[PDB]
Amino acid sequence: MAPMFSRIRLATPSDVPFIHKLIHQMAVFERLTHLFSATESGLASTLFTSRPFQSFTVFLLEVSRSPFPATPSPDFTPFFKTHNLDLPIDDPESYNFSPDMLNDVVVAGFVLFFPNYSSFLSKPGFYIEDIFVREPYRRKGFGSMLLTAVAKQAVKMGYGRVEWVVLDWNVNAIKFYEQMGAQILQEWRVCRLT
Amino acid sequence: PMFSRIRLATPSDVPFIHKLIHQMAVFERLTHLFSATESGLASTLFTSRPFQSFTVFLLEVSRSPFPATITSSPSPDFTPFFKTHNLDLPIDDPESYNFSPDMLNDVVVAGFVLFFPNYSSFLSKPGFYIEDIFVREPYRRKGFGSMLLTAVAKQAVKMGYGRVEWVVLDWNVNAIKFYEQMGAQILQEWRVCRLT
């Protein structure tokens, strides 16, 4: 039995290797590795050109068996959660997700989002492009914490809705979203110009 | 004769943006959901440089050529697009006085597109998402919507960005026919989800 603490914080440039590995794990999970062409240089030079919440923004979820310290944006401060005693985590990839090998802090998941716009309300919102929790850390509430963190940020900033898309056959994801109070819209279809 | 120009919106264009969005809501029979205000547009659309976040292209028309340059251009690296259209009968525009930057000249705002950067994570590559595209009724079926949509795509190419995306209602067949004629793919598998 071990304790567990979590923290959600903003990603910074030094987190690019973790973000890259998380996106790669997502591609493997989606069975779309052949579409994975992301690079660390591309992530660094596209995700951090603007300030947090101005354009692309990433929240990272980290976990530790010990409390985090008390202390990238004036509009955000990290969230903390304490979890109940449970079996220790078995994480074969911890060495790829540790900012410091000697410290017991591991990146467990992320959400990538950016501002969208409700024109009929003249009000920004947020759109979530990706949400992913690594396999050893699932079914502990982390995905829900990540999604609701974006919603809490929206409320804080006076923004409107949070939106995303799901595959209609993805009844598992639909279940995960329904339990969050999300509405699934049947009437819209995504259009694309290559 | 008729000349057209696509340029970036500035804060002085907020009244036109507000009235174009209102026309969209009237068109969709959704005026009960229109709560946008000029102050809200002015305080939210211009907090970043063009193309960094929310961006509006405005389509304007005139019977005379446009100036070679705009002194008030919000970006030194963007130049408006121009097109000359075939001589044709005059277009009746009962709303022209609501869409004229100055009564001095005949320049009228005929349409817009509102967009912002989106992201393809598997490619680590931004794209653009179009939130609004609208051509006022007097100016439709003359190629102006095609110009506005392809201007966003041309801007994406210029910036090394990826695809342009938007959403459409499943039953909005007229818009779908336009998008398909433009070469867009209507994806069947994705559904929008929302939290308010």
Swiss-Prot record, chain B:
Tissue localization of expression: Expressed throughout the plant.
Job description of the protein: Probable protein acetyltransferase with dual specificity triggering both N-alpha-acetylation (NTA) and epsilon-lysine acetylation (KA).
- Which residues of the parent protein does this chain contain? 29 to 224 of 236
* Gene name in the database record: GNAT8
Does the keyword Hydrolase feature in the UniProt annotation? Answer: no
Q: Which organism is it from?
A: Arabidopsis thaliana
Q: Could you list the residue ranges that cross the membrane?
A: none
What top-tier enzyme class does this entry carry? transferase
* Subunit field text: Oligomer.
- What is the protein's name according to its record? GCN5-related N-acetyltransferase 8
Taxonomy, top ranks, is: Eukaryota, Viridiplantae, Streptophyta, Embryophyta, Tracheophyta
What are its E.C. numbers?
2.3.1.48
